[model samples]
Target: AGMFRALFRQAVEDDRYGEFLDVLAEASAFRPQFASPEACSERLDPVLLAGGPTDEGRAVLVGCTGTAANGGPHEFLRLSTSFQEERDFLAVPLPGYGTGTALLPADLDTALDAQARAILRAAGDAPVVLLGHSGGALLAHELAFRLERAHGAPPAGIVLVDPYPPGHQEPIEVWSRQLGEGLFAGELEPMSDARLLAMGRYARFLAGPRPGRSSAPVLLVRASEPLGDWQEERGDWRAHWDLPHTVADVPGDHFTMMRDHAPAVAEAVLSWLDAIE
Candidate 1:
């Protein structure tokens, strides 16, 4: 995890030809070469980090970042230090928000799929354990389902830190619009209540069915601080899933929960992983 954090910090900070090339190499071996001097000049290192699984010998951590952010990779590394002596970790940057946002979802999916396939190939049939935070958690859930369908087995377990539905619904839109109004004084176009409602339905489909009939054990760690009236809506998501579920409340607001209150979050996740293992 520390290694991931260091690499990510470097990727985000450096600029210039030599520095860019060095950072690019560390980001991913799969990075594309600059087409021209102009292209190279304009390129921004969107990838925070791409690392191989470490030799933790027990579990693997697949770190996901949240909305328009690429800091989860480093944050997961910080959380991992408390749980295991070492953990094989993979930090993937998501699309439409990170450096890879310009790439279409299908293309980004292909890249992520290949990365996951590589991990499985290296693990050689060892069961994987996934830990995702925020939006990353959703990605982890999505990946777990895909892996189960592709292979015969699901991950050993999953830990979700304040996971929420990404879809917008009518009521949700009203909520968002009200919030937007407060923030922007109605200068921004408020999302329609109808569209928000449609998005709410879409989130259900996006989440998919809980891992299948025999679902994998899941631990959902929610933030104690309320982000508007969304807590009730998030709770509804918990009941919708069919998995063996356990929910816990951790201290701090949404953003701080990922950093300031990570220790408590780590403790809960480690305990759950221990039981499942």
Candidate 2:
């Protein structure tokens, strides 16, 4: 489940990139890419990691980061398991990031809408609390509004763990540069180029305000540790979601929140759910 993060830490810290790249290449070629909504409907299935289906009530729906092994689902495994017994946990994999690729649509609305539709198909009429970390958190925000529009009600809640939401006015190029320069080691594997371009496009695509906000409650879990050294100039290295929401703090850096500190994340999530639900 932690295949990518473990490898990423090792690769970045120890200059061991060969095994990580091999794992990523194998994963990228594992699934088919969808260019149309029809294809996404056919292929973009959500994995039911824990709990039963959402027929009774609300479920916890997770979105994937931009980079993770096995198409990004593995990134949330620990966090999902940490609180699964309290709620149904479903992880939604986005296109072109993990095992699947989507030439889905050029425009931001169409592309995000396509992803939202897939989440709805899996979730049924049951309300959901959308949760995501990193890039996935942005997806959760976008999907909350789309789901609200389609379902005739807002999501149960929205949870963003160290998210970088749109319209915060951070320079768009910085995302690509940070990802390319900080996360990657430039050997240019089959998976790296397309992934890099996708991050760049995502940064540009979501550079403005959302169409509207969902009335659902929101939570932002900020990482206690600062980001890399490049972010030292920002005073606070945490990313903000330009909306009204409560904030929680968790120990560990961005990746570790889903790893060593997943149980702590669950504690925060569960307490919030208790108060709201």
Candidate 3:
């Protein structure tokens, strides 16, 4: 970790941040973020968590949680568990997330393509509903595009739980510095340096590119409480999604939307799923 941090510092000083990441990505030590042989042997690949049934007729709910900084697949544990038994829920860990090699895609397009491919493999021929929270909502949006454009398989619907839109003016360095403070203070989970780099770079990527609207049905689930300082600077984050969509109000803030109020989240999702069906 220290070595990674040292390299980052050097890269920042040399103004070669992007080049450094590309070089680091070539390391064999950081390859294979998903679908490991050990995981395949265990029948629970890291790419698709909590194996869903194969060749199902029903639409499966495939969830992508906030950031890789937070643990993977487990993020949706509470919410998925709260759903009715009739529903099939599968969570996909973002690259560099969960227990695996910390290799991260060098760019946003690569990450989205990789994730989209995994979602397709996991869902097989069954219709799928993409569910994403926070930053993952943006990913889900892009994945929706990838599915349609690259694979000709769009999701049955997309449920964005408290979606975060891009347009943040804050520089990446500022965010990374603060994140480093949090890590050093023992306020955040300790991750490998490569994972940390991926998290920081992805944070910038998530806030910039606005994906084109999709034809798939969308349900935007808004948390009742506002995030701290969001209103003061960012204005209305909910107005970010320009696609035709329905809204469902739920209790909790951003993180709590999936933590303490997961049952409420599940209720809103299930209700929306039923309405669309």
- Decide which is better by lDDT, 2 or 3: 3
| Span of ten consecutive residues with least summed lDDT in model 2 | 171-180
Q: Give a tens-digit lDDT track for model 1, residues 69-170.
A: 223235465565554543455555443222322322323234335435644665555567666765456666766766676656577777777665444222
User: What Cα-based lDDT does every candidate model obtain?
Assistant: 0.48, 0.61, 0.63
Candidate 3 C-alpha error for residue 223, in Å: 1.1
Predictions: Cα RMSD each: 13.2, 7.2, 6.3
- Which ten-residue region of model 3 has the weakest summed lDDT? 37-46
What TM-score would candidate 1 get against the native?
Answer: 0.56
What is the TM-score of candidate 2?
Answer: 0.71
- Each model's TM-score, in the order given? 0.56, 0.71, 0.71
Number of clashes recorded per candidate: 11, 3, 0
Tell me the tens digit of each residue's lDDT in model 2 across 1-277: 2445545555545544434445545454433444555554335567888773334555565553443322354566777776656777777766555433355234456555666766778777676788887766777777788768764647788988877665452532233333433444322233344453344445444555668877888888878875445466654556687664678899986666767898888788878877776
